[PDB]
Amino acid sequence: RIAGVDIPRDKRVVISLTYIFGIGRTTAQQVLKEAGVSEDTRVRDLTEEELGKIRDIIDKLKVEGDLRREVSLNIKRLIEIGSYRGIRHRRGLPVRGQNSKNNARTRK
Amino acid sequence: SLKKGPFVDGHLMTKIEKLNETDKKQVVKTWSRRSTIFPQFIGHTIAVYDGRKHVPVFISEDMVGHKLGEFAPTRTYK
Amino acid sequence: EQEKIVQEVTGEPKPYPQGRKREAGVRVKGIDNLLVRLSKCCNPVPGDDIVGFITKGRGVSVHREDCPNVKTNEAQERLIPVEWE
Amino acid sequence: MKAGIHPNFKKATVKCACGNEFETGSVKEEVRVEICSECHPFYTGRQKFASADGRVDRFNKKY
Amino acid sequence: NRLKEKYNKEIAPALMTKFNYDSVMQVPKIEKIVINMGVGDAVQNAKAIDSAVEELTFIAGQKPVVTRAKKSIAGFRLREGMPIGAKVTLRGERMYDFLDKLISVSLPRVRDFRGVSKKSFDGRGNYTLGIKEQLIFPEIDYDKVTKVRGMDIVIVTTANTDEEARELLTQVGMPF
RNA sequence: CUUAUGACCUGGGCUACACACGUGCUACAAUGGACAGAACAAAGGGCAGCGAAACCGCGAGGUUAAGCCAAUCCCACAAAUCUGUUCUCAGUUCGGAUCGCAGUCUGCAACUCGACUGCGUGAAGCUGGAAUCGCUAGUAAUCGCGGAUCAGCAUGCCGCG
Numbered sequence: 001r002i003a004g005v006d007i008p009r010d011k012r013v014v015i016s017l018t019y020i021f022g023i024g025r026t027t028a029q030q031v032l033k034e035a036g037v038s039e040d041t042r043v044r045d046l047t048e049e050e051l052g053k054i055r056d057i058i059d060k061l062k063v064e065g066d067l068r069r070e071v072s073l074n075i076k077r078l079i080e081i082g083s084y085r086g087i088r089h090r091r092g093l094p095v096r097g098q099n100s101k102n103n104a105r106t107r108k
Numbered sequence: 109s110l111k112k113g114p115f116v117d118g119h120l121m122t123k124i125e126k127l128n129e130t131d132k133k134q135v136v137k138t139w140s141r142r143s144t145i146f147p148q149f150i151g152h153t154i155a156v157y158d159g160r161k162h163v164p165v166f167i168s169e170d171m172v173g174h175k176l177g178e179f180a181p182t183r184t185y186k
Numbered sequence: 187e188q189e190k191i192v193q194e195v196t197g198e199p200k201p202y203p204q205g206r207k208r209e210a211g212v213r214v215k216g217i218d219n220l221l222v223r224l225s226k227c228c229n230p231v232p233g234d235d236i237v238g239f240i241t242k243g244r245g246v247s248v249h250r251e252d253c254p255n256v257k258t259n260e261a262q263e264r265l266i267p268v269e270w271e
Numbered sequence: 272m273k274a275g276i277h278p279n280f281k282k283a284t285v286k287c288a289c290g291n292e293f294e295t296g297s298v299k300e301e302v303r304v305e306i307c308s309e310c311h312p313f314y315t316g317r318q319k320f321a322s323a324d325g326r327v328d329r330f331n332k333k334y
Numbered sequence: 335n336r337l338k339e340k341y342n343k344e345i346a347p348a349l350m351t352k353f354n355y356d357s358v359m360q361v362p363k364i365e366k367i368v369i370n371m372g373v374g375d376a377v378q379n380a381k382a383i384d385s386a387v388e389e390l391t392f393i394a395g396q397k398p399v400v401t402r403a404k405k406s407i408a409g410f411r412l413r414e415g416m417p418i419g420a421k422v423t424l425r426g427e428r429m430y431d432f433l434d435k436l437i438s439v440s441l442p443r444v445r446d447f448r449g450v451s452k453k454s455f456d457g458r459g460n461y462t463l464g465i466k467e468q469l470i471f472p473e474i475d476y477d478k479v480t481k482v483r484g485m486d487i488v489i490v491t492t493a494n495t496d497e498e499a500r501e502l503l504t505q506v507g508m509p510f
Numbered sequence: 511c512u513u514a515u516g517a518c519c520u521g522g523g524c525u526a527c528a529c530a531c532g533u534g535c536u537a538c539a540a541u542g543g544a545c546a547g548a549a550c551a552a553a554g555g556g557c558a559g560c561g562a563a564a565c566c567g568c569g570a571g572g573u574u575a576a577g578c579c580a581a582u583c584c585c586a587c588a589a590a591u592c593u594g595u596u597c598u599c600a601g602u603u604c605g606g607a608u609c610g611c612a613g614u615c616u617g618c619a620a621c622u623c624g625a626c627u628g629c630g631u632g633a634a635g636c637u638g639g640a641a642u643c644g645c646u647a648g649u650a651a652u653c654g655c656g657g658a659u660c661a662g663c664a665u666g667c668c669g670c671g
Contacts, residue, residue, distance in 0.1 A: 002305060004443065014603085015602095015603050021630095022631085023630085024632090026628090060320070065445075065446040070611085071609085071610045074611080081170050082171070082244075083178040084181065085622095087181075089609085093527085094608075095608085095609065100526050101526075101529095106608040107609095108527095110615080111334065111614095115619060117618085139521055142621080157521055158221065158522070159522030161219060164220055164240055164246055165240075166242070172330045173330070177622060178621055179243055180621070180622070181244060182521090182523075182622060278395040295336075296428060298395055299472075302472055308507075309438070310442070311441075313447075313448065313449075314509060
């Protein structure tokens with residue numbers, strides 16, 4: 001697959017492409033705005049000239065590994081420079097600014 | 109903030125321009141946790157007040173975009 | 187049995203949460219009232235002089251110079267000549 | 272070469288979506304590829320995107 | 335067939351002058367390609383052994399062989415006998431054509447493939463491929479893929495030293 | 511009690527978190543989700559206060575600014591509803607936390623410690639054990655809106671259909 005990980009062949013055009021890491025719903029709409037494929041066809045049933053225009057737009061964006069690097073780069077950045085928000089990423093506690101006596105069960 | 113520039117207090121900009129003009133020198137007890145970090149501050153060590161003491165910290169080429177309040181552990185835990 | 191008293195006295199570090207009665211005792215290069223801590227690499231006592239290393243954060247370690255940890259320091263600028271006061 | 276054990280071996284015509292036509296001998300006859308190695312940009316020396324994108328910020332004064 | 339004419343007419347004269355060997359007999363070759371499977375599923379599932387008994391045959395039609403572990407291992411809860419993984423051995427014409435599938439086709443389907451491990455030689459002139467996912471080439475057919483185990487590939491050369499097998503794979507086209 | 515248990519300033523904290531508890535919303539979907547069309551309220555508030563229209567920003571909004579000390583003008587285009595389109599029963603086109611980056615406002619200042627968008631990420635959960643709680647008719651549940659409080663901030667509480 002273009003992302004290196006598949007889309008299911010029977011879903012619609014927008015939502016199958018949202019399984020691509022880094023690509024959500026509104027990122028899919030900007031691509032298909034440039035593609036112009038009406039967004040409701042079987043993605044088992046396309047042409048490659050149609051899908052070659054799908055490829056190079058994905059080639060233009062931070063999609064597969066690059067978006068996996070740079071946030072993990074930022075995690076490795078801010079922890080190793082102190083930077084208290086680094087410690088909240090570090091210990092297993094919330095980051096964005098919350099209390100602590102309450103639930104916070106996404107991180108312990 | 110958004111477009112007013114990164115915020116500094118007048119005393120912080122004063123002594124660091126006295127620091128940058130001649131030579132790097134002793135640490136500075138700031139009480140301005142609230143202030144940002146400018147790219148001129150690199151290599152300047154300063155003392156941030158934590159609530160009960162001024163903790164000395166370092167500024168490198170990576171600790172640039174944030175404020176000074178990222179380096180003030182005010183709530184110690186175990 | 188008095189070695190068992192040494193076993194039962196574990197709990198004297200328990201008065202070192204909740205603060206301890208401390209002066210400015212490690213005078214930091216003539217400047218007082220700065221966050222420093224005693225080094226656990228080797229104990230800072232008046233043998234050789236005692237030097238404060240600017241850490242990344244979480245305190246300043248008074249590493250007690252002539253230590254194998256203080257001698258192998260990358261970024262020698264972080265070492266500060268401080269006073270035992 | 273035991274008979275009745277090995278599956279067949281047919282001269283494959285491997286084709287990439289960018290036009291890279293390639294020849295092997297395989298079990299399947301036709302192989303149509305989205306991105307081959309010659310289509311892959313890391314084989315094209317530096318790839319165009321991530322070589323220019325992998326920079327750190329320039330301690331961004333700009334605003 | 336394509337790589338052998340490339341290897342004989344182009345690659346072999348190139349490396350010969352590169353290190354000044356005294357004969358064509360001293361020019362190193364890459365003889366055999368052996369592929370391990372090594373699945374320890376038979377402790378839990380004997381039917382999971384049948385996956386990649388059938389599936390590895392589709393990669394290269396030389397059928398892999400039952401590999402029984404020759405020591406009973408209680409820490410893995412494993413007795414002696416008790417087949418663990420399969421063994422694809424491959425030497426000859428199709429194997430460079432298997433390498434033709436590897437460089438040209440397979441490697442861009444590793445979904446975050448980059449400059450692969452340089453220093454993974456045994457100090458002899460032989461190389462191992464670190465592959466953890468088996469969906470590398472368009473035969474794999476995801477809907478008929480229940481088992482997610484990858485594949486281990488060994489490169490065996492006649493390289494008398496090691497650091498020209500370094501330079502062999504570059505002229506072959508192994509990316510780094 | 512008193513050159514301190516009083517007064518003033520900075521900054522911290524009242525927001526900590528291995529863990530239980532009440533009390534509240536958003537959900538675990540097809541009586542749903544998504545998009546589009548159509549139509550319908552009551553009550554309250556507005557002078558350094560509301561800000562129309564207009565233009566620009568994907569947007570939160572910015573810009574300038576009519577009108578309104580008010581049944582005149584503005585907040586404010588209500589939501590559920592209805593009709594199409596698409597979705598087809600799975601941890602998914604449900605979930606929306608958690609988290610990254612990019613932003614906007616107010617204010618000296620949003621780091622601890624604000625709200626809200628924009629992009630991404632997409633877990634827990636697929637009606638919850640023993641036991642318990644509310645309700646006699648516009649109530650039960652359900653859906654939005656207004657206001658005190660406030661520079662700023664509501665899943666809070668009043669009050670309204």
